[PDB]
Design a protein around this ligand. Structure first.
Ligand SMILES: C=CCn1c(=O)c2[nH]c(Cc3ccc(NC(C)=O)cc3)nc2n(CCCC)c1=O
Ligand SMILES: [Mn+2]
Length: 603
């Protein structure tokens, strides 16, 4: 029966639990074939070739083994609306707000989800191959393993880069447990609807669901990576944050980097930023300060767990970078540019006529007669009034290829976090850098995060779309870390690269010069008496920030804290947290809200 549909591998060499998961979902989805992924170069070559034949990928001949996927324009981003967590009780998933609808996640009842599942999954893979992806989140060797079933070869190839994938994962798994991951593009053959750019999706029925009690992730109708690469946001943030809450650790939307001063002293820092803040540019930043070194552990997700000496240790559970393409250049991110030179999948970027990539802000003058095809497969000029690349277009690239990849990026011990950075995009009022007054205040600073998307929105811990459970409880869990025995708590900082003058010009040059801010953090961690007290925390004392080699910087306006601005700010923060977190807001946070208005009242 089922064996006859297998086109690669053998049912018999799957652990019983993997086999049963496959059997149940094959019976349900009715795929024409089953391909058990081995994760070999040869398999990758084959799937890339097949995808080229079918129009899903084009070859980018300018480079060594680079490819380009163009999507249906309806399927270009994750949809928060259609992203749900399923629990017996709503409160376990999101706080019940005081007014309005929750902005802290989306809950669906078990009953509603069973209905939603039956209207989508039966027969969904008809005419397609079901791929079986064994993957490890974190280095191969305890780490969490999952099995993703998908009808998308694009997902297979992306998973190979973004996770450890294939036969060795099944070998490490044995009869262990795994997260069950089910994905379909939702377009059974014969196609009932038009195919755009050979890219199957079902936007109307798109649903990305998490069932934490069953250890199941179920995703329908979208091929876009945030929705389809189930190890990443779905597992390593949402489900894991839940597990972490239970087991006394932390799963966070954080880059991790290692920074070394000119005397050879090295610290690791984790940072959470909302979108459009240049996460990845900071993760592999090339520092301008002489003698300094920055190395990249990860640009997206961090798993953090206290060791026996109370140090918070971080592992990057990913195997790659799924980076925003537009804005990437030799100037803004020289390390990303070298990373993506080979073995990289690009999605929704433009293509030059010599088979190179192009996007807004690539800052690379075209040769004579070279022209650009846009991401909607049209000839493109700068007079079109339309970007050549989609704003959310991506590169998907092996982490091992980053020239400053950290030597301990795959250490199963993890790397000791000495500082946590929170930040946002704030055109007014928020200084370039400040330090939390205490752990409790640092939790509040994370909880208070807002960022410009032209709208300024709340995005606490940069986790707004990613909480796996009640944010009030997530806040209590963060607070609880100050009572871990002998905890060596990271110093907490808040940054803003994006403060502007009245004409909208950026006050801080940023990029490589951000090394000057990390320098201040670095020395503060080491106890340097370099702080000046303000109502919002510590800022750099006068002349403490290293400005050697820069043009003029308006330091006064950059570090300016206005009573009027901060009155408006704390009112907005209180309002947001009391309303949205309501009965689940920990009283330590209530105290921090009051303490801040009290400090502001005194100015
Ligand atoms: C480690 C670097 C992080 N970083 C920054 O530090 C940063 N700072 C800015 C604002 C800025 C933009 C352009 C200039 N250019 C010139 C010439 O002054 C200066 C500041 N944009 C920044 N960006 C781009 C974010 C959008 C994807 C950014 O990524
Ligand atoms: Mn992210």
């Amino acid at each position: 029966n089922l064996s006859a549909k297998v086109v690669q591998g053998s049912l018999d060499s799957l652990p019983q639990a993997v086999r049963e998961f496959l059997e149940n979902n094959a019976e349900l989805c009715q795929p024409d074939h089953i391909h058990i992924c081995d994760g070999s170069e040869e398999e990758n070559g084959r799937l890339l070739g097949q995808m080229e034949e079918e129009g899903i990928l084009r070859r980018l001949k300018k480079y060594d083994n680079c490819w380009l996927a163009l999507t249906d324009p309806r399927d270009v981003a994750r949809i928060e609306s259609k992203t749900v967590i399923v629990t017996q009780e709503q409160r376990d998933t999101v706080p019940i707000p005081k007014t309005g609808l929750s902005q802290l996640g989306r809950w669906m009842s078990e009953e509603d989800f069973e209905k939603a599942f039956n209207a989508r999954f039966p027969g969904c893979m008809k005419g397609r191959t079901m791929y079986v992806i064994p993957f490890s989140m974190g280095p191969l060797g305890s780490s969490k393993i999952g099995i993703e079933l998908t009808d998308s070869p694009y997902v297979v190839a992306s998973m190979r880069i973004m996770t450890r994938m294939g036969t060795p994962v099944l070998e490490a798994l044995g009869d262990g447990e795994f997260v069950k991951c089910l994905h379909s593009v939702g377009c059974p053959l014969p196609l009932q609807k038009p195919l755009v750019n050979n890219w199957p999706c079902n936007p109307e029925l798109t649903l990305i669901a998490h069932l934490p009690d069953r250890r199941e992730i179920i995703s329908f109708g979208s091929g876009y990576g945030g929705n389809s690469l189930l190890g990443k946001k779905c597992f390593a943030l949402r489900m894991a944050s839940r597990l972490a809450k239970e087991e006394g650790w932390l799963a966070e939307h954080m880059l991790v980097l290692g920074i070394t001063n000119p005397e050879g002293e090295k610290k690791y820092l984790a940072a959470a930023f909302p979108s459009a803040c240049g996460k990845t540019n900071l993760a592999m930043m090339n520092p301008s300060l002489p003698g300094w070194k920055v190395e990249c552990v990860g640009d997206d997700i961090a798993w953090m767990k206290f060791d026996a000496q109370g140090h918070l240790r971080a592992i990057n559970p990913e195997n790659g970078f799924f980076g925003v393409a537009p804005g990437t250049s030799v100037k803004t991110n020289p390390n990303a540019i070298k990373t993506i030179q080979k073995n990289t999948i690009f999605t929704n970027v433009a293509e030059t006529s010599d088979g190179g990539v192009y996007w807004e802000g690539i800052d690379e003058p075209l040769a004579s007669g070279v022209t650009i095809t846009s991401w909607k497969n049209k000839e493109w000029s700068s007079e079109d009034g339309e970007p050549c690349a989609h704003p959310n277009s991506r590169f998907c690239t092996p982490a091992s290829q980053c020239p400053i990849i950290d030597a301990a990026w795959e250490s199963p011990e993890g790397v000791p976090i000495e500082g946590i950075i929170f930040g946002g995009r704030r055109p007014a009022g928020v200084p370039l850098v400040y330090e939390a007054l205490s752990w409790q205040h640092g939790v509040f600073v994370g909880a208070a995060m807002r960022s410009e998307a032209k709208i300024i929105m709340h995005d606490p811990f940069a986790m707004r779309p990613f909480f796996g459970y009640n944010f009030g409880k997530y806040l209590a869990h963060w607070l609880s870390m100050a009572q871990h025995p002998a905890a060596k708590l990271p110093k907490i900082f808040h940054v803003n690269w994006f403060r502007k003058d009245k004409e909208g010009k950026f006050l801080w040059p940023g990029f490589g010069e951000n090394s000057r801010v990390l320098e201040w953090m670095f020395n503060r961690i080491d106890g340097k008496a370099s702080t000046k007290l303000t109502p919002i925390g510590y800022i750099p004392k006068e002349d403490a920030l290293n400005l050697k080699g820069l043009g003029h910087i308006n330091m006064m306006e950059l570090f300016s804290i206005s009573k009027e601005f901060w009155d408006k700010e704390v009112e907005d923060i209180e309002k947001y947290l009391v309303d949205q977190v309501n009965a689940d807001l920990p009283c330590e946070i209530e105290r921090e809200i009051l303490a801040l208005k009290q400090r502001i009242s005194q100015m």
